[PDB]
Write a protein that binds this ligand. Structure first.
Ligand code: MYR
Length: 118
């Protein structure tokens, strides 16, 4: 609540277009949503609530971590969603990509060899 950033406001505004439901009709991301993901995923990774990086490396790292934990534990829609959120935001943010659906973004991150397994 002090300083602002280009990639920050640009990422959020763009994320609004991202289709979390995957289909191209409502159910898109946003400010509150993006926060709910990073916030939850943060605590899940035994990391303080003040986790707000600004590098594609930091994002891809958080994913691999949360994935590893959620993996050995099984699978959870909640945590799963948070992951896909940080993914689309990372690509559509750092890469300023126009992710049509959170699902597509995650597919690219993994397809490129960033996210462990599909
Ligand atoms: C005042 O409102 C403080 C909150 C503003 C934080 C700025 C954004 C910091 C960078 C986070 C980017 C997300 C990376 C996954």
């Amino acid at each position: 609540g002090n300083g602002q950033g280009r990639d920050w406001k640009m990422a959020i505004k763009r994320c609004s277009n991202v289709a979390v439901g995957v289909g191209g009709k409502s159910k898109k991301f946003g400010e509150g949503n993006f926060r709910w993901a990073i916030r939850m995923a943060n605590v899940s990774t035994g990391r303080e609530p003040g986790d707000i990086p600004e590098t594609l490396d930091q994002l891809r790292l958080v994913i691999c971590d949360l994935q590893e934990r959620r993996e050995k534990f099984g699978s959870s829609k909640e945590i799963d969603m948070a992951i896909v959120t940080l993914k689309v935001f990372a690509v559509a943010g750092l890469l300023n990509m126009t992710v049509s659906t959170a699902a597509a973004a995650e597919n690219m991150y993994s397809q490129m060899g960033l996210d462990t397994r599909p």
